[PDB]
Amino acid sequence: LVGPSCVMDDFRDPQRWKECAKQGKMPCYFDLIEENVYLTERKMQCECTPLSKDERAQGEIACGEDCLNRLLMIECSSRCPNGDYCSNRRFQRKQHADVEVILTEKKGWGLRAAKDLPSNTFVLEYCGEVLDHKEFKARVKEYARNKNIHYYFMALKNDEIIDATQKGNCSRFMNHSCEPNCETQKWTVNGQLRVGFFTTKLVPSGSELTFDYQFQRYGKEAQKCFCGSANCRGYLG
Numbered sequence: 693l694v695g696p697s698c699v700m701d702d703f704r705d706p707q708r709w710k711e712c713a714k715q716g717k718m719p720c721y722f723d724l725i726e727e728n729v730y731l732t733e734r735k736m737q738c739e740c741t742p743l744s745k746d747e748r749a750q751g752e753i754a755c756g757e758d759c760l761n762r763l764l765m766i767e768c769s770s771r772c773p774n775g776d777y778c779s780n781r782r783f784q785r786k787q788h789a790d791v792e793v794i795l796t797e798k799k800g801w802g803l804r805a806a807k808d809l810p811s812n813t814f815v816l817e818y819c820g821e822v823l824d825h826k827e828f829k830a831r832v833k834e835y836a837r838n839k840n841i842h843y844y845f846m847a848l849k850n851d852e853i854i855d856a857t858q859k860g861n862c863s864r865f866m867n868h869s870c871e872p873n874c875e876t877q878k879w880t881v882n883g884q885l886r887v888g889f890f891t892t893k894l895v896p897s898g899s900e901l902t903f904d905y906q907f908q909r910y911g912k913e914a915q916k917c918f919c920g921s922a923n924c925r926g927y928l929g
């Protein structure tokens with residue numbers, strides 16, 4: 693840590709956070725949420741064989757790589773034949789990676805791995821206010837008017853854009869790299885689409901977590917990229 697760092701639980705205490713933010717030891721306040729909030733409310737089984745007690749004890753994985761739901765990018769429900777053992781309920785169970793929020797040299801705050809993160813594993817859900825096209829139009833205008841530095845929008849599906857500017861979780865801090873170590877994936881949980889960050893390589897402990905952030909934004913000048921990669925393209929857009 694060339695700058696200060698904090699752990700995800702530090703964001704649960706809003707009085708101590710606002711006091712840490714005063715000292716520059718934590719990022720500016722936002723409303724911490726556990727699940728997406730719709731600004732305007734909107735109007736089955738895999739074939740995995742139930743693991744036995746012995747297989748469970750023996751260390752076998754329930755609803756692993758071959759799970760049909762997993763391949764469909766659908767999380768299992770409580771009715772999964774593997775029930776409580778099911779490893780394919782990661783969003784629902786908040787089975788997030790061990791990550792810290794850190795102050796970077798030039799990009800603001802960021803996320804780093806607090807221990808080694810295996811390749812192709814779940815990091816964090818990207819939570820926020822879900823906007824329709826009209827709300828999105830309005831927020832784009834407001835954030836431009838207010839001269840906000842950072843963007844926190846992520847497209848989810850037609851007529852659904854997540855905005856983590858005001859409400860979100862620590863995933864809002866993920867920075868862009870031209871040579872990233874994470875990607876987004878859109879998963880269906882009880883018929884509703886959600887989006888999360890997943891590693892694309894083994895991320896060693898202490899490394900910043902990054903993705904390809906390609907959200908379009910108007911600006912008098914383009915936004916220069918500070919990712920530091922050999923192949924850095926120079927700009928976020």
Ligand SMILES: CCC[NH2+][C@@H](CC[C@@H]([NH3+])C(=O)O)C[C@H]1O[C@@H](n2cnc3c(N)ncnc32)[C@H](O)[C@@H]1O
Pocket residue numbers: 719798799800801802841842843844845846863864865866867868869905916917918919
């Ligand atoms: C969907 C998740 C969006 N995350 C935010 C992170 C904000 C966080 N840094 C904060 O302090 O709250 C993105 C923003 O961080 C900045 N940023 C990200 N990577 C770069 C980069 N490589 N070069 C320069 N600027 C960058 C930039 O302003 C961008 O809009």
Ligand SMILES: [Zn+2]
Pocket residue numbers: 738739740754755756759760761762768780
């Ligand atoms: Zn399964």
Ligand SMILES: [Zn+2]
Pocket residue numbers: 738740754755768769772773774775778779780
């Ligand atoms: Zn399952």
Ligand SMILES: [Zn+2]
Pocket residue numbers: 869870871917918919920921923924925926927
């Ligand atoms: Zn770059």
